[PDB]
Amino acid sequence: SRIEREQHHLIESIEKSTQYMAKRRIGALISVARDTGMDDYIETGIPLNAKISSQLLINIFIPNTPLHDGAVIIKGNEIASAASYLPLSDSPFLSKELGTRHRAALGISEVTDSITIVVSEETGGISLTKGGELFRDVSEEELHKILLKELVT
Ligand SMILES: Cc1cncnc1N
Ligand SMILES: [Cl-]
């Protein structure tokens, strides 16, 4: 179909699912592939090759469920995999109060041009990684403008 419609639907799906999980302190880790490949990391997860929806993203990350423990990787117009491994950053600049999801999101951002979104299960804050930088606890307006700029081409 039309690319721009899928991209805006992707953005709305992330905004809606992360708002839902943030409110309930459900951790999440969602990495959006771009030009650089996430293919090897997709292979580490459970293959879904599913249509993107906020409902599916929420169901994946329910705690103590088969699909929740690891990253979701979106590729093109599909949720490609759940429970994928991402490389963990060894950076000592990452705050010690952040968890493995953040360290994983930082690590993939150091070696891909992917955009990765984290929901902390400790605080509910939403964070974002790109190019080896972390944007910690962004507002809904900040998240919206970042995703517009980064995911709509
Ligand atoms: C430990 C871990 C958790 N989630 C994603 N990647 C990882 N390496
Ligand atoms: Cl967390």
User: 37: which DSSP letter?
Assistant: -
Q: Please name the residue that has the structure tokens 């699912």.
A: 17
Q: Rounded to an integer, what distance in angstroms lies between the CA atom of residue 118 and that of residue 31?
A: 9
Beta-carbon contacts of 29 under 8 Å, excluding residues fewer than 6 positions away, are: 70, 71, 72, 86, 101, 104, 105, 116, 117, 118, 119
Ligand 1: residues with CB < 6 A are 29, 70-71, 85-86, 88, 100, 104
Mutate to test the pocket of ligand 1, among 86, 110, 117 (most ligand atoms within 8 A of CB): 86
Q: Note whether 63 and 21 are within 8 A (CB).
A: no
Q: How buried is 122 (Cβ within 10 angstroms: 0-12 exposed, 13-18 middle, 19+ buried)?
A: exposed
- Which of 83, 121, 70 is closest to 99 using CA atoms? 121
Resolution of the experimental model, in Å, one decimal: 1.8
**Which is nearest to 37 in space by CA: 88, 91, 73, 83?**
73
Strand partners, 69: none
- What does DSSP say about strands 78-84 and 126-130: parallel, antiparallel, or unpaired? unpaired
Do 71 and 32 meet the contact criterion of CB atoms below 8 Å apart?
Answer: no
How far does the centroid of ligand 2 lie from the alpha carbon of residue 103, in Å?
Answer: 10
Closest ligand 1 atom to residue 70 Cα is 4
Instruction: Count CB neighbours of 17 within 10 A.
Output: 26
Ligand 2 centroid–CA 57 distance in Å is 17
Q: Say whether 4 sits in a helix, a strand or coil.
A: helix
Specify the experimental method.
Answer: X-ray
Q: CA–CA separation, 102 vs 148, rounded Å? A: 22
Provide the phi-psi class of 66: left if phi over 0, else alpha when psi is between -120 and 50, else beta. alpha
The string of DSSP codes covering 75-125 is ETTEEEEEEE--PPP--TTS-TTS-HHHHHHHHHHHHS--EEEEE-TTT--
Which residue type, as a one-letter code, is found at position 99? G
